[PDB]
Amino acid sequence: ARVAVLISGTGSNLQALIDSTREPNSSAQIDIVISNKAAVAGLDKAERAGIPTRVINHKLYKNRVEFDSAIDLVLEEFSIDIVCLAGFMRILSGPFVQKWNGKMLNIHPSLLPSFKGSNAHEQALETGVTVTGCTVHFVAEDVDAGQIILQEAVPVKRGDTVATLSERVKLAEHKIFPAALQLVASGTVQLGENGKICWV
């Protein structure tokens, strides 16, 4: 299966996916990396790995649908089968999500359904949980509400900050995102016709 990875920043999740998809038994190949932001470290990581990159600046588009259309054009250019959102921070439009239904995965740094949104660690710390984690899910129109593929729990230590908690949770993200991508790319896991996860 042919994979696009969408990023907005550092790209540690991208790097873990590069490493995993290059293992001999990988059912996935990363063929394009798309950032909505110029000059982020994730682009350097892609270039170092010899993977093509595109920058599609959302600020240059009148609305989400036009921006998503520009992304979709590149996905078609590279005959992409599966999209991974890896630190990509834009909400995607309904029609784009529908087109890619069952083919698009996101990593989120909480145990969904807790702490949806862009500041999950801030929320986890404010709430005072002692266990947080990360989630890979299929992307549905409602943000962070699509079907869960894998999760991993991560402890919150007393005195944690976003810096220390995010660091600990990223170690888990780097395990479950490659594992989830392999499950979907191999056809082991799919989004069922009933909209529920199906393990074949």
Ligand X SMILES: NCC(=O)N[C@@H]1O[C@H](COP(=O)([O-])[O-])[C@@H](O)[C@H]1O
Ligand Y SMILES: Nc1nc2[nH]c(CCCc3cc(C(=O)N[C@@H](CCC(=O)O)C(=O)O)cs3)cc2c(=O)[nH]1
Q: Distance between the two ends of the chain, CA-based, in angstroms? A: 17
Q: Which of residues 118-157 bind ligand X (CB under 6 A)?
A: 118, 120
Identity of the residue, 115 or 183, whose beta carbon is nearer to ligand Y in the bound complex:
115
Minimum CB separation of residue 90 from ligand Y in Å reads 4
* 107 near ligand X, judged by CB under 6 A: yes
Q: Hey, which residues between 116 and 155 contact ligand Y (CB under 6 A)?
A: 117-118, 139-141, 143-144, 146
The contacts of residue 37 (CB under 8 Å, 6+ apart) are 8, 9, 55, 57
99 is in an annotated binding site: no
Q: What are phi and psi of 22, to 5 degrees?
A: -95, -5
- Which residue among 108, 121, 137, 174 is the active-site one? 108
Output the smallest distance, CB 112 to ligand X, in A: 11
Q: Is 9 in the site for ligand X (CB under 6 A)?
A: yes
For residues 136 and 106, the answer to whether their CB atoms sit within 8 Å is yes
Q: At its nearest, how many Å lie between ligand Y and the CB of residue 161?
A: 19
Cα 145 to the center of its chain, rounded Å: 14
Cβ pair 65, 73 in contact under 8 A: no
Which residues are known catalytic residues?
Answer: 108
